[PDB]
């Protein structure tokens, strides 16, 4: 290429969007924004493919341009806007509030939230830096730079912030015995307690996470998101509690539901 790419093919799109193979040649290329395009839902897929509120992309444009959709309390008219993890989407016309939270199988589950939960959000802080005449700044996972934070907040901690002010309400420290969720890799979408973190200087440090049913797994620091203090989460969880079931248990639950509901 001679410059940045502007298109995206459906088969080269991320698989968690669950796009078809014969609808088109092109997938929605997400605009640049607070989330990576590999790790986001564009608003067209959420409004059209998930919620079924629109049948075509023209109807998505027609809904967004009438100023009904808010992301983190801000009206967005870009239909390919990158919406990511812990993300609050408010539709005030229908009176609906959703959070984008990862599903157990690695996809973005649409999790309807009670409206007073839609006032805050959780952010994983990416870096700390002191600049411009001794003022400290946080940078979080969704690129919200917050100046003058609490001095006890370090990197890999999480913060609960109010969406109307953008200012920190209260934070969770990254430590063992805390509740977290996986945002990347093979174990994506699983919720469990941090057992220990092993250090590998000059490389990736590995975290071990134990499930509520005694299932242990591991990831990297780049794929951990602390969501609770201790065991109680600071957010509402999806219909599955983040427990990965094997295919045998999924089959057994499916046959049980078939037997119960006929």
């Amino acid at each position: 290429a001679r410059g940045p790419k502007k298109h995206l093919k459906r088969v080269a799109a991320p698989k968690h969007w669950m796009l078809d193979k014969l609808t088109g040649v092109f997938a929605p290329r997400p605009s640049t924004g607070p989330h990576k395009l590999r790790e986001c839902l564009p608003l067209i897929i959420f409004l059209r493919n998930r919620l079924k509120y629109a049948l075509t992309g023209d109807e998505v444009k027609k809904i967004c341009m009438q100023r009904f959709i808010k992301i983190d309390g801000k009206v967005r008219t870009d239909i390919t806007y990158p919406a990511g993890f812990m993300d609050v989407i408010s539709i005030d016309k229908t009176g609906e509030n959703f959070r984008l939270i990862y599903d157990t199988k690695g996809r973005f589950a649409v999790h309807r939230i009670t409206p007073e939960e839609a006032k805050y959000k959780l952010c994983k802080v990416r870096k700390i830096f002191v600049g411009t005449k001794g003022i400290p700044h946080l940078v979080t996972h969704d690129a919200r730079t917050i100046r003058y934070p609490d001095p006890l907040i370090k990197v890999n901690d999480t913060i609960q912030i109010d969406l109307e002010t953008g200012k920190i309400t209260d934070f969770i420290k990254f430590d063992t015995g805390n509740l977290c969720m996986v945002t990347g890799g093979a174990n994506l979408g699983r919720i469990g307690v941090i057992t220990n973190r092993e250090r590998h200087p000059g490389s990736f440090d590995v975290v071990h996470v134990k499930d509520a049913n005694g299932n242990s797994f591991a990831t990297r620091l780049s794929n951990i998101f602390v969501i609770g203090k201790g065991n109680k989460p600071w957010i509402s969880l999806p219909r599955g509690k983040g427990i990965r079931l094997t295919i045998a248990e999924e089959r057994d639950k499916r046959l049980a539901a078939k037997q119960s509901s006929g």
Partner: peptide, 30 residues
């Protein structure tokens, strides 16, 4: 906005120096 936020963090930093002073106190004293 800068004046009030800087004054609030100035209160926070004077606080953080106060508890830093006391933590230094039981660390040195013991």
């Amino acid at each position: 906005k800068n004046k009030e936020e800087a004054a609030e963090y100035a209160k926070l930093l004077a606080k953080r120096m106060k508890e830093a002073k006391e933590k230094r106190q039981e660390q040195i004293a013991k």
